[PDB]
Ligand binder design. Sequence first.
Ligand code: CL
Ligand code: CL
Lengths: 346, 346
Amino acid sequence: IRSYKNLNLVRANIETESRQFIENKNYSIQSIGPMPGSRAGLRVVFTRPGVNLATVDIFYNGDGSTTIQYLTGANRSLGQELADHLFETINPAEFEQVNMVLQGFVETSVLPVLELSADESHIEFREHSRNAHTVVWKIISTSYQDELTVSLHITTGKLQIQGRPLSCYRVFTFNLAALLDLQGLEKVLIRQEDGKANIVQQEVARTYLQTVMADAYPHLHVTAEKLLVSGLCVKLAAPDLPDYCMLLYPELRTIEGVLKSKMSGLGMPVQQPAGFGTYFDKPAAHYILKPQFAATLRPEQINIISTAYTFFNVERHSLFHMETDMARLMGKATRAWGIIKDLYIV
Amino acid sequence: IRSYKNLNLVRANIETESRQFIENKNYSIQSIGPMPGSRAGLRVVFTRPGVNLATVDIFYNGDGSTTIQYLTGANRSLGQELADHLFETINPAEFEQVNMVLQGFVETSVLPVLELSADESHIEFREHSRNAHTVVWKIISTSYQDELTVSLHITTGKLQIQGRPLSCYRVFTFNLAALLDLQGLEKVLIRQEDGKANIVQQEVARTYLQTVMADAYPHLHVTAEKLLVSGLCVKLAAPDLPDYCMLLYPELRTIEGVLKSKMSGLGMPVQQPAGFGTYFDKPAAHYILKPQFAATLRPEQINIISTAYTFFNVERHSLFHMETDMARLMGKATRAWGIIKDLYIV
Ligand SMILES: [Cl-]
Ligand SMILES: [Cl-]
């Protein structure tokens, strides 16, 4: 079932979290300290009146891993409670491993997607290594201890992505989705090879798209429409996955296009330093256009733009920061289609 | 590549047809007669002023096929013209071969649809043989030289269909589609094994349907909705084919369902001997209800029923008698969905 070996815990967060756990069930600490003996780690010995002393050993591995042992001592039933508290401070996406190869890349096409991914405030990249066969970049997250290894095999033009599907992976694949064919898109979105989005009848998917987007269908640019039909066939052919929310990437991307090109048609060009922020404020959970810009539009146009940016901003924020059933994804997908529709209808 | 061996030509029609070719190209007959020797057939020697005599030998084989030999004589180029004329008197579907096995059938499940298919004017069936392990039926057509072999292995309950995707195949599989699961439905509709309809995400297809059926989606019968989503997932996963027209089966039967039970609720139950022939007439090229029945209903109800039955009737007539681009198939699919939701909304 559940295994506590080689966890990816934040080391600086262990002790604090353990202490507050103990104080939330009003248990009492017998001792918390460095682990005796060769191995580095933490020993937490706590109890509650009525049962024996629970001992939990927290070993520090050499690769930054952590292992929790609760089956020692005289109260394993109690120590497992602390073990589970520590285990549930980890994002599930931390128990996964990504190791993909995309075809047809060279350095002048890959560098831009890295620089766009480093235009977020919590993402940094740097050139890790290079010879004449491969060039390796690493993408680090400043808030979470998360690094993604992006290696470009020059002579084969093959791009390798290694690590865990966390915030660097998500930002990078989001900015990289603009360039990919159907199979590459399906690879980055479902994290599996041998996916079968390529067998979906593209003309039946296209009739799906005309049905849900009606009058906007002639105004879509084929950038937008071929990424929407490609998203449709990634969704229709998706396997069973614990989280489907990366499948929302194709729609968000086209929202980011259409909004960013509607607003510039109304005297609101989007720049690189400030971007969307210069044009919106945020009372409660809403984004609303600032009054100086809202006084130039009409009341129907102000809300199409505001709810569009709210949707785009908060679902990209929750995808990029790991929140910070295919039915939920389809609900958000059809909301998105309605949004892209309304933006073309106004 | 093109090969003129083992064609299935209507033998009694060969001679006249060749004669008419000769009279349409103003060619002149040197001889038309039975082929000399044991093997029966026809020898056609014709010419036009300016070239040599073309000889075309048309052998009748033991399996009812016919073979055309045009490389005899002194004019291969001219005789091939007649060979090609005869060759294009054959339906492309007659060069195809179907040999499939469907699972989970019993004798009381097959006899009804096999007998239902023999209530057509050009279809009759008979029990060909039976022992204690399997029982074989044949379905022969009265107009075309076409027989379909339907063998049910009792002990394993497997039903296998052998022959050509012609008139009998279409009638039988049409009556059989209401009973099938997704994989069997796709088997009979695309006449290929190893299809990939089962990988279509049933929830995205179901949202497609929920979108196209507007208010009718909550009152659709669960029978109807399951047949419509199975049709949607066979179309989305359809391989690449010369004719897509059997993909219309799931909707046609569903209309026949909804129609036959919405007229069941307003005092017009449909029987087996007559059917819908004692309700609507045959004016021009449409199907209007008879005045005795139209005078009891409302003005939209008379036309919902006549246009619905007209669509059903003429698309079934064109599919059963081989009247003849996924775009065209989708075009009729949208018209079918509009009809079914109009019958639920009226
Ligand atoms: Cl690829
Ligand atoms: Cl089957």
